[PDB]
Write an enzyme that holds these catalytic residues in place. Structure first.
Site, mmCIF file in Angstrom:
data_model
loop_
_atom_site.group_PDB
_atom_site.id
_atom_site.type_symbol
_atom_site.label_atom_id
_atom_site.label_comp_id
_atom_site.label_asym_id
_atom_site.label_seq_id
_atom_site.Cartn_x
_atom_site.Cartn_y
_atom_site.Cartn_z
ATOM 1 N N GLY A 94 0.784 -1.233 0.000
ATOM 2 C CA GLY A 94 0.000 0.000 0.000
ATOM 3 C C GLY A 94 0.815 1.282 0.000
ATOM 4 O O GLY A 94 0.296 2.351 -0.324
ATOM 5 N N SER A 95 2.092 1.170 0.360
ATOM 6 C CA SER A 95 2.986 2.322 0.488
ATOM 7 C C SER A 95 3.473 2.832 -0.870
ATOM 8 O O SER A 95 4.090 2.086 -1.636
ATOM 9 C CB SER A 95 4.173 1.960 1.389
ATOM 10 O OG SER A 95 5.232 2.890 1.261
#
Ligand SMILES: CCCCCCSC[C@H](NC(=O)CC[C@H]([NH3+])C(=O)O)C(=O)NCC(=O)O
Ligand SMILES: CCCCCCSC[C@H](NC(=O)CC[C@H]([NH3+])C(=O)O)C(=O)NCC(=O)O
Lengths: 216, 217
Positions: free
Chosen positions: A8-9
Protein backbone atom coordinates in the site's frame (compact mmCIF):
# COMPACT_ATOMS: atom_id res chain seq x y z
CA UNK A 1 18.45 -7.91 -2.37
CA UNK A 2 16.14 -7.71 0.64
CA UNK A 3 13.28 -5.26 0.17
CA UNK A 4 11.43 -4.23 3.32
CA UNK A 5 8.08 -2.96 2.13
CA UNK A 6 4.31 -2.59 2.24
CA UNK A 7 2.20 -2.98 -0.96
CA UNK A 8 0.00 0.00 0.00
CA UNK A 9 2.99 2.32 0.49
CA UNK A 10 3.60 4.76 -2.40
CA UNK A 11 7.39 5.11 -1.90
CA UNK A 12 7.61 1.29 -1.77
CA UNK A 13 5.66 1.04 -5.06
CA UNK A 14 7.96 3.59 -6.74
CA UNK A 15 11.01 1.40 -6.02
CA UNK A 16 9.12 -1.69 -7.26
CA UNK A 17 8.42 0.00 -10.61
CA UNK A 18 12.04 1.15 -10.86
CA UNK A 19 13.45 -2.32 -10.07
CA UNK A 20 11.17 -3.83 -12.74
CA UNK A 21 12.35 -1.22 -15.26
CA UNK A 22 16.08 -1.94 -14.69
CA UNK A 23 15.37 -5.69 -14.56
CA UNK A 24 16.33 -6.74 -11.02
CA UNK A 25 14.30 -9.02 -8.76
CA UNK A 26 13.64 -7.95 -5.17
CA UNK A 27 13.47 -10.30 -2.20
CA UNK A 28 10.15 -9.07 -0.82
CA UNK A 29 10.02 -8.77 2.97
CA UNK A 30 6.65 -7.50 4.16
CA UNK A 31 7.13 -5.24 7.17
CA UNK A 32 3.94 -4.77 9.18
CA UNK A 33 4.08 -1.26 10.66
CA UNK A 34 0.87 -1.92 12.64
CA UNK A 35 2.55 -4.86 14.38
CA UNK A 36 5.57 -2.59 14.94
CA UNK A 37 7.88 -4.81 12.88
CA UNK A 38 9.88 -1.73 11.85
CA UNK A 39 10.58 -1.18 15.57
CA UNK A 40 12.07 -4.62 16.29
CA UNK A 41 15.81 -4.75 17.23
CA UNK A 42 16.53 -6.63 13.96
CA UNK A 43 15.21 -3.83 11.74
CA UNK A 44 16.59 -1.00 13.90
CA UNK A 45 20.17 -2.30 13.59
CA UNK A 46 19.73 -2.10 9.81
CA UNK A 47 17.70 1.12 9.76
CA UNK A 48 17.76 3.41 12.84
CA UNK A 49 15.25 5.67 11.04
CA UNK A 50 12.85 2.66 11.16
CA UNK A 51 11.08 3.33 7.87
CA UNK A 52 10.12 1.63 4.62
CA UNK A 53 11.11 1.12 1.88
CA UNK A 54 14.47 -0.19 3.09
CA UNK A 55 16.78 -1.95 0.62
CA UNK A 56 19.52 -4.28 1.85
CA UNK A 57 21.97 -5.14 -0.93
CA UNK A 58 23.86 -8.45 -0.95
CA UNK A 59 27.07 -6.66 0.13
CA UNK A 60 25.36 -5.44 3.33
CA UNK A 61 24.66 -1.88 2.15
CA UNK A 62 21.48 -0.60 3.79
CA UNK A 63 19.59 2.15 1.96
CA UNK A 64 16.33 3.97 2.57
CA UNK A 65 14.41 6.92 1.09
CA UNK A 66 12.68 5.54 -2.02
CA UNK A 67 14.10 8.19 -4.38
CA UNK A 68 17.66 7.53 -3.23
CA UNK A 69 16.94 3.81 -3.83
CA UNK A 70 15.55 4.63 -7.32
CA UNK A 71 18.75 6.38 -8.38
CA UNK A 72 20.91 3.62 -6.82
CA UNK A 73 19.06 0.92 -8.80
CA UNK A 74 19.60 2.77 -12.09
CA UNK A 75 23.25 3.63 -11.35
CA UNK A 76 24.34 0.19 -10.18
CA UNK A 77 21.86 -2.22 -11.82
CA UNK A 78 21.06 -0.32 -15.03
CA UNK A 79 24.58 -0.19 -16.50
CA UNK A 80 23.83 -3.32 -18.56
CA UNK A 81 21.43 -1.25 -20.72
CA UNK A 82 22.85 2.23 -21.35
CA UNK A 83 19.86 3.50 -23.35
CA UNK A 84 17.40 2.31 -20.68
CA UNK A 85 19.38 3.93 -17.85
CA UNK A 86 19.56 7.07 -19.99
CA UNK A 87 15.75 7.12 -20.48
CA UNK A 88 15.11 6.65 -16.74
CA UNK A 89 17.85 8.97 -15.49
CA UNK A 90 19.39 11.22 -18.22
CA UNK A 91 23.06 12.05 -17.60
CA UNK A 92 23.00 15.60 -19.05
CA UNK A 93 23.23 17.83 -15.93
CA UNK A 94 20.43 20.19 -17.08
CA UNK A 95 18.07 17.30 -17.97
CA UNK A 96 18.96 15.48 -14.73
CA UNK A 97 18.38 18.70 -12.73
CA UNK A 98 14.70 18.68 -13.70
CA UNK A 99 14.46 14.98 -12.76
CA UNK A 100 16.03 15.76 -9.36
CA UNK A 101 13.78 18.83 -9.02
CA UNK A 102 10.62 16.77 -9.57
CA UNK A 103 11.81 14.02 -7.20
CA UNK A 104 12.21 16.59 -4.43
CA UNK A 105 8.87 18.13 -5.46
CA UNK A 106 7.29 14.70 -4.94
CA UNK A 107 8.68 14.10 -1.43
CA UNK A 108 8.39 17.69 -0.11
CA UNK A 109 5.23 18.98 -1.80
CA UNK A 110 3.06 16.49 -3.71
CA UNK A 111 3.25 13.45 -1.40
CA UNK A 112 3.82 15.58 1.72
CA UNK A 113 0.58 17.59 1.41
CA UNK A 114 -1.29 14.42 0.45
CA UNK A 115 -0.12 12.87 3.74
CA UNK A 116 -0.89 16.07 5.69
CA UNK A 117 -4.47 15.90 4.38
CA UNK A 118 -5.39 12.18 4.36
CA UNK A 119 -3.45 10.77 7.35
CA UNK A 120 -5.70 12.59 9.88
CA UNK A 121 -8.68 11.15 7.96
CA UNK A 122 -7.62 7.49 8.40
CA UNK A 123 -5.38 7.45 11.51
CA UNK A 124 -5.72 8.73 15.10
CA UNK A 125 -8.67 11.15 15.21
CA UNK A 126 -10.14 9.64 12.00
CA UNK A 127 -12.04 12.84 11.09
CA UNK A 128 -13.89 12.42 7.75
CA UNK A 129 -14.03 16.20 7.17
CA UNK A 130 -10.77 17.42 5.64
CA UNK A 131 -9.34 20.73 6.84
CA UNK A 132 -9.95 23.48 4.21
CA UNK A 133 -6.35 24.70 4.69
CA UNK A 134 -4.86 21.25 4.07
CA UNK A 135 -7.09 20.75 1.01
CA UNK A 136 -6.07 24.13 -0.46
CA UNK A 137 -2.42 23.17 0.12
CA UNK A 138 -2.82 19.76 -1.54
CA UNK A 139 -4.72 21.28 -4.50
CA UNK A 140 -1.95 23.87 -4.92
CA UNK A 141 0.46 20.91 -5.29
CA UNK A 142 -1.77 19.44 -8.01
CA UNK A 143 -1.95 22.88 -9.65
CA UNK A 144 1.88 22.91 -9.72
CA UNK A 145 2.12 19.42 -11.27
CA UNK A 146 -0.54 20.30 -13.87
CA UNK A 147 1.49 23.36 -14.92
CA UNK A 148 4.70 21.26 -15.15
CA UNK A 149 2.87 18.92 -17.55
CA UNK A 150 1.58 21.74 -19.80
CA UNK A 151 2.75 20.91 -23.34
CA UNK A 152 4.82 18.04 -21.91
CA UNK A 153 4.43 14.25 -22.02
CA UNK A 154 6.28 13.63 -18.73
CA UNK A 155 6.90 15.36 -15.40
CA UNK A 156 10.56 16.26 -15.98
CA UNK A 157 10.22 16.47 -19.76
CA UNK A 158 11.88 14.09 -22.21
CA UNK A 159 10.39 11.59 -24.65
CA UNK A 160 10.31 8.72 -22.14
CA UNK A 161 9.28 8.21 -18.50
CA UNK A 162 12.03 8.99 -16.00
CA UNK A 163 12.30 7.88 -12.37
CA UNK A 164 10.53 11.16 -11.50
CA UNK A 165 7.49 9.85 -13.41
CA UNK A 166 7.71 6.54 -11.54
CA UNK A 167 7.88 8.33 -8.17
CA UNK A 168 4.98 10.66 -8.98
CA UNK A 169 2.96 7.80 -10.52
CA UNK A 170 3.12 5.93 -7.20
CA UNK A 171 2.10 9.16 -5.44
CA UNK A 172 -0.77 10.05 -7.82
CA UNK A 173 -2.10 6.46 -7.78
CA UNK A 174 -2.49 7.01 -4.03
CA UNK A 175 -4.38 10.27 -4.74
CA UNK A 176 -6.80 8.25 -6.88
CA UNK A 177 -7.62 5.58 -4.27
CA UNK A 178 -7.97 8.27 -1.58
CA UNK A 179 -10.98 9.49 -3.57
CA UNK A 180 -9.56 12.69 -5.08
CA UNK A 181 -11.01 13.66 -8.48
CA UNK A 182 -7.86 13.90 -10.64
CA UNK A 183 -9.95 14.87 -13.70
CA UNK A 184 -9.95 18.44 -12.33
CA UNK A 185 -6.33 18.55 -13.52
CA UNK A 186 -6.45 17.74 -17.22
CA UNK A 187 -2.68 17.45 -17.77
CA UNK A 188 -2.26 15.32 -14.62
CA UNK A 189 -5.15 13.02 -15.65
CA UNK A 190 -3.78 12.75 -19.21
CA UNK A 191 -0.28 11.97 -17.89
CA UNK A 192 -1.63 9.52 -15.29
CA UNK A 193 -3.41 7.54 -18.03
CA UNK A 194 -0.39 7.70 -20.37
CA UNK A 195 2.20 6.60 -17.80
CA UNK A 196 0.09 3.77 -16.34
CA UNK A 197 -0.29 2.20 -19.80
CA UNK A 198 3.44 2.17 -20.67
CA UNK A 199 5.73 1.89 -17.62
CA UNK A 200 6.83 -1.57 -16.34
CA UNK A 201 5.17 -2.68 -13.08
CA UNK A 202 2.38 -0.10 -13.40
CA UNK A 203 -0.27 -2.78 -12.84
CA UNK A 204 1.46 -3.66 -9.54
CA UNK A 205 1.32 0.05 -8.64
CA UNK A 206 -2.48 0.14 -9.12
CA UNK A 207 -2.72 -3.20 -7.29
CA UNK A 208 -0.83 -1.92 -4.24
CA UNK A 209 -2.63 1.44 -4.23
CA UNK A 210 -5.96 -0.40 -3.78
CA UNK A 211 -4.54 -1.95 -0.58
CA UNK A 212 -3.96 1.59 0.73
CA UNK A 213 -7.53 2.33 -0.42
CA UNK A 214 -8.97 -0.05 2.20
CA UNK A 215 -8.37 2.67 4.84
CA UNK A 216 -11.05 4.92 3.29
CA UNK B 1 23.79 33.45 -13.11
CA UNK B 2 20.73 34.96 -11.39
CA UNK B 3 20.14 33.78 -7.82
CA UNK B 4 16.75 34.74 -6.36
CA UNK B 5 17.21 34.37 -2.62
CA UNK B 6 17.08 35.58 0.97
CA UNK B 7 20.15 35.29 3.28
CA UNK B 8 17.91 34.08 6.14
CA UNK B 9 16.69 31.14 4.04
CA UNK B 10 18.43 27.83 4.83
CA UNK B 11 17.96 26.29 1.35
CA UNK B 12 19.34 29.52 -0.16
CA UNK B 13 22.42 29.32 2.11
CA UNK B 14 23.05 25.70 1.11
CA UNK B 15 23.25 26.83 -2.54
CA UNK B 16 25.55 29.74 -1.57
CA UNK B 17 28.01 27.36 0.14
CA UNK B 18 27.96 24.94 -2.83
CA UNK B 19 28.56 27.76 -5.34
CA UNK B 20 31.46 29.05 -3.21
CA UNK B 21 32.97 25.54 -3.20
CA UNK B 22 32.91 25.19 -7.01
CA UNK B 23 33.92 28.83 -7.62
CA UNK B 24 30.59 29.92 -9.09
CA UNK B 25 29.84 33.62 -8.71
CA UNK B 26 26.13 34.22 -8.19
CA UNK B 27 24.27 37.36 -9.26
CA UNK B 28 22.36 37.85 -5.99
CA UNK B 29 18.75 39.02 -6.32
CA UNK B 30 16.96 39.69 -3.02
CA UNK B 31 13.42 38.30 -3.15
CA UNK B 32 11.28 39.76 -0.35
CA UNK B 33 8.69 37.05 0.33
CA UNK B 34 6.66 39.24 2.73
CA UNK B 35 6.30 41.93 0.04
CA UNK B 36 5.17 39.28 -2.47
CA UNK B 37 8.13 39.68 -4.84
CA UNK B 38 7.97 35.92 -5.50
CA UNK B 39 4.31 36.34 -6.56
CA UNK B 40 5.11 39.01 -9.19
CA UNK B 41 4.19 38.02 -12.80
CA UNK B 42 7.83 38.14 -13.98
CA UNK B 43 8.96 35.72 -11.26
CA UNK B 44 5.93 33.44 -11.76
CA UNK B 45 6.90 33.20 -15.45
CA UNK B 46 10.32 31.88 -14.39
CA UNK B 47 9.14 29.87 -11.37
CA UNK B 48 5.40 29.00 -11.15
CA UNK B 49 6.14 27.26 -7.83
CA UNK B 50 7.05 30.80 -6.62
CA UNK B 51 9.82 29.77 -4.25
CA UNK B 52 13.43 30.57 -3.33
CA UNK B 53 16.15 29.66 -4.06
CA UNK B 54 15.69 29.94 -7.83
CA UNK B 55 18.69 29.79 -10.18
CA UNK B 56 18.59 31.10 -13.74
CA UNK B 57 21.68 29.90 -15.62
CA UNK B 58 23.64 31.40 -18.55
CA UNK B 59 21.14 30.03 -21.12
CA UNK B 60 18.02 31.07 -19.18
CA UNK B 61 17.44 27.57 -17.80
CA UNK B 62 15.44 27.92 -14.58
CA UNK B 63 15.94 25.66 -11.56
CA UNK B 64 14.59 25.57 -8.03
CA UNK B 65 14.78 23.19 -5.04
CA UNK B 66 18.13 23.92 -3.39
CA UNK B 67 19.36 20.31 -3.43
CA UNK B 68 18.81 19.90 -7.19
CA UNK B 69 20.67 23.22 -7.64
CA UNK B 70 23.53 21.93 -5.45
CA UNK B 71 23.91 18.82 -7.63
CA UNK B 72 23.66 20.92 -10.82
CA UNK B 73 26.41 23.24 -9.53
CA UNK B 74 28.81 20.34 -8.88
CA UNK B 75 27.96 18.26 -11.99
CA UNK B 76 28.14 21.09 -14.53
CA UNK B 77 30.07 23.96 -12.92
CA UNK B 78 32.41 21.85 -10.75
CA UNK B 79 33.55 19.53 -13.55
CA UNK B 80 36.64 21.71 -14.13
CA UNK B 81 38.12 20.24 -10.94
CA UNK B 82 37.58 16.46 -11.04
CA UNK B 83 38.97 15.84 -7.53
CA UNK B 84 36.82 18.54 -5.90
CA UNK B 85 33.62 17.32 -7.58
CA UNK B 86 34.44 13.80 -6.35
CA UNK B 87 34.84 15.09 -2.76
CA UNK B 88 31.58 17.08 -2.91
CA UNK B 89 29.54 14.51 -4.83
CA UNK B 90 31.22 11.07 -5.07
CA UNK B 91 30.35 9.10 -8.22
CA UNK B 92 30.43 5.62 -6.64
CA UNK B 93 26.74 4.53 -6.60
CA UNK B 94 26.86 3.37 -2.94
CA UNK B 95 28.58 6.53 -1.65
CA UNK B 96 26.35 8.76 -3.80
CA UNK B 97 23.25 6.94 -2.50
CA UNK B 98 24.17 7.93 1.08
CA UNK B 99 24.64 11.54 -0.08
CA UNK B 100 21.24 11.39 -1.80
CA UNK B 101 19.66 9.70 1.23
CA UNK B 102 20.96 12.48 3.52
CA UNK B 103 19.78 15.23 1.12
CA UNK B 104 16.29 13.68 1.17
CA UNK B 105 16.46 13.29 4.96
CA UNK B 106 17.20 17.01 5.23
CA UNK B 107 14.26 18.13 3.04
CA UNK B 108 11.66 15.58 4.24
CA UNK B 109 12.63 15.22 7.92
CA UNK B 110 15.24 17.55 9.43
CA UNK B 111 14.31 20.88 7.81
CA UNK B 112 10.68 19.85 7.31
CA UNK B 113 10.03 19.40 11.04
CA UNK B 114 11.96 22.58 11.84
CA UNK B 115 9.81 24.64 9.44
CA UNK B 116 6.55 23.18 10.79
CA UNK B 117 7.34 24.52 14.27
CA UNK B 118 9.41 27.68 13.74
CA UNK B 119 8.32 29.22 10.41
CA UNK B 120 4.82 30.20 11.64
CA UNK B 121 6.63 32.52 14.12
CA UNK B 122 8.11 34.44 11.16
CA UNK B 123 4.71 35.06 9.52
CA UNK B 124 3.23 35.98 12.93
CA UNK B 125 1.14 32.82 13.24
CA UNK B 126 2.99 31.91 16.46
CA UNK B 127 0.80 30.03 18.93
CA UNK B 128 2.23 30.52 22.48
CA UNK B 129 1.15 27.02 23.56
CA UNK B 130 1.26 24.27 20.97
CA UNK B 131 0.99 20.58 20.18
CA UNK B 132 3.69 18.49 21.93
CA UNK B 133 3.89 16.34 18.77
CA UNK B 134 5.71 19.10 16.86
CA UNK B 135 8.40 19.24 19.56
CA UNK B 136 8.88 15.46 19.72
CA UNK B 137 9.18 15.49 15.92
CA UNK B 138 12.24 17.79 15.94
CA UNK B 139 13.80 15.88 18.86
CA UNK B 140 13.40 12.62 16.91
CA UNK B 141 14.91 14.15 13.74
CA UNK B 142 17.95 15.38 15.69
CA UNK B 143 18.34 11.93 17.30
CA UNK B 144 18.52 10.37 13.79
CA UNK B 145 21.20 12.87 12.66
CA UNK B 146 23.28 12.31 15.84
CA UNK B 147 23.13 8.56 15.16
CA UNK B 148 24.23 9.01 11.52
CA UNK B 149 27.22 11.01 12.81
CA UNK B 150 28.30 8.42 15.39
CA UNK B 151 31.91 7.45 14.64
CA UNK B 152 31.71 9.63 11.50
CA UNK B 153 33.19 13.02 10.60
CA UNK B 154 30.53 13.83 8.01
CA UNK B 155 26.81 13.19 7.47
CA UNK B 156 27.14 10.79 4.52
CA UNK B 157 30.50 9.41 5.61
CA UNK B 158 33.75 9.95 3.76
CA UNK B 159 36.89 11.91 4.55
CA UNK B 160 35.54 15.20 3.17
CA UNK B 161 32.35 17.29 3.37
CA UNK B 162 29.80 16.57 0.62
CA UNK B 163 26.82 18.61 -0.61
CA UNK B 164 24.82 16.67 2.03
CA UNK B 165 26.97 18.30 4.75
CA UNK B 166 26.38 21.75 3.21
CA UNK B 167 22.62 21.17 3.05
CA UNK B 168 22.44 19.95 6.66
CA UNK B 169 24.90 22.68 7.76
CA UNK B 170 22.49 25.35 6.51
CA UNK B 171 19.60 23.56 8.26
CA UNK B 172 21.39 23.08 11.60
CA UNK B 173 22.57 26.73 11.62
CA UNK B 174 18.87 27.64 11.41
CA UNK B 175 18.05 25.30 14.34
CA UNK B 176 20.79 26.97 16.41
CA UNK B 177 19.81 30.56 15.53
CA UNK B 178 16.11 29.87 16.21
CA UNK B 179 17.24 28.96 19.74
CA UNK B 180 17.26 25.15 19.71
CA UNK B 181 19.39 23.49 22.41
CA UNK B 182 21.64 21.11 20.47
CA UNK B 183 23.74 20.03 23.49
CA UNK B 184 22.08 16.60 23.90
CA UNK B 185 23.38 15.82 20.42
CA UNK B 186 27.15 15.68 20.92
CA UNK B 187 27.87 14.32 17.43
CA UNK B 188 25.75 17.05 15.80
CA UNK B 189 27.49 19.84 17.74
CA UNK B 190 30.95 18.34 17.09
CA UNK B 191 30.17 17.91 13.37
CA UNK B 192 28.70 21.43 13.11
CA UNK B 193 31.78 23.03 14.72
CA UNK B 194 34.32 21.13 12.61
CA UNK B 195 32.40 21.43 9.31
CA UNK B 196 31.72 25.18 9.75
CA UNK B 197 35.47 25.72 10.26
CA UNK B 198 36.52 24.21 6.90
CA UNK B 199 33.79 24.63 4.26
CA UNK B 200 33.93 27.55 1.78
CA UNK B 201 31.13 30.09 2.28
CA UNK B 202 30.53 28.99 5.88
CA UNK B 203 30.78 32.62 7.05
CA UNK B 204 27.74 33.57 4.93
CA UNK B 205 25.88 30.58 6.38
CA UNK B 206 26.38 31.97 9.90
CA UNK B 207 25.70 35.57 8.76
CA UNK B 208 22.59 34.53 6.83
CA UNK B 209 21.32 32.41 9.72
CA UNK B 210 21.63 35.46 12.01
CA UNK B 211 19.21 37.33 9.70
CA UNK B 212 16.73 34.49 10.33
CA UNK B 213 17.51 34.83 14.06
CA UNK B 214 16.26 38.43 14.08
CA UNK B 215 12.71 37.03 13.77
CA UNK B 216 13.04 35.50 17.26
CA UNK B 217 13.90 38.60 19.33
C1 LIG C 1 -0.98 0.63 3.52
C2 LIG C 1 0.42 1.23 3.57
C3 LIG C 1 0.53 2.27 4.68
C4 LIG C 1 1.94 2.85 4.75
C5 LIG C 1 2.00 4.22 4.07
C6 LIG C 1 3.13 5.06 4.66
S1 LIG C 1 4.73 4.70 3.90
C7 LIG C 1 5.39 4.19 5.52
C8 LIG C 1 6.44 5.14 6.07
N1 LIG C 1 7.50 5.36 5.09
C9 LIG C 1 7.77 6.57 4.61
O1 LIG C 1 6.86 7.64 4.72
C10 LIG C 1 9.11 6.77 3.94
C11 LIG C 1 9.05 8.05 3.10
C12 LIG C 1 10.39 8.38 2.45
N2 LIG C 1 10.42 9.80 2.13
C13 LIG C 1 10.52 7.59 1.19
O2 LIG C 1 10.10 8.09 0.12
O3 LIG C 1 11.02 6.45 1.19
C14 LIG C 1 7.00 4.59 7.35
O4 LIG C 1 7.95 3.56 7.30
N3 LIG C 1 6.56 5.12 8.49
C15 LIG C 1 6.99 4.61 9.79
C16 LIG C 1 8.12 5.40 10.40
O5 LIG C 1 8.74 6.27 9.73
O6 LIG C 1 8.47 5.20 11.58
C1 LIG D 1 14.41 35.46 5.68
C2 LIG D 1 14.07 34.00 5.99
C3 LIG D 1 12.60 33.71 5.72
C4 LIG D 1 12.33 32.20 5.71
C5 LIG D 1 12.36 31.67 4.28
C6 LIG D 1 12.08 30.17 4.23
S1 LIG D 1 12.69 29.40 2.71
C7 LIG D 1 11.38 30.20 1.73
C8 LIG D 1 10.53 29.23 0.92
N1 LIG D 1 11.38 28.29 0.22
C9 LIG D 1 11.41 26.99 0.50
O1 LIG D 1 10.96 26.43 1.72
C10 LIG D 1 11.99 26.12 -0.59
C11 LIG D 1 12.36 24.76 0.00
C12 LIG D 1 12.84 23.79 -1.07
N2 LIG D 1 12.61 22.43 -0.61
C13 LIG D 1 14.30 24.02 -1.29
O2 LIG D 1 15.14 23.39 -0.62
O3 LIG D 1 14.69 24.86 -2.13
C14 LIG D 1 9.66 29.99 -0.03
O4 LIG D 1 10.19 30.47 -1.24
N3 LIG D 1 8.39 30.17 0.33
C15 LIG D 1 7.43 30.93 -0.46
C16 LIG D 1 6.54 30.05 -1.29
O5 LIG D 1 6.83 28.84 -1.48
O6 LIG D 1 5.50 30.50 -1.81
Amino acid sequence: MDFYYLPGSAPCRAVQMTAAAVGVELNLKLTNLMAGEHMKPEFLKLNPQHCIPTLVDEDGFVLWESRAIQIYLVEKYGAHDADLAERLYPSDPRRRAVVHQRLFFDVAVLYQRFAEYYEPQIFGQKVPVGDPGRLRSMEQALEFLNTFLEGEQYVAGGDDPTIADLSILATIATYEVAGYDLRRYENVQRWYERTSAIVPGADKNVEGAKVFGRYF
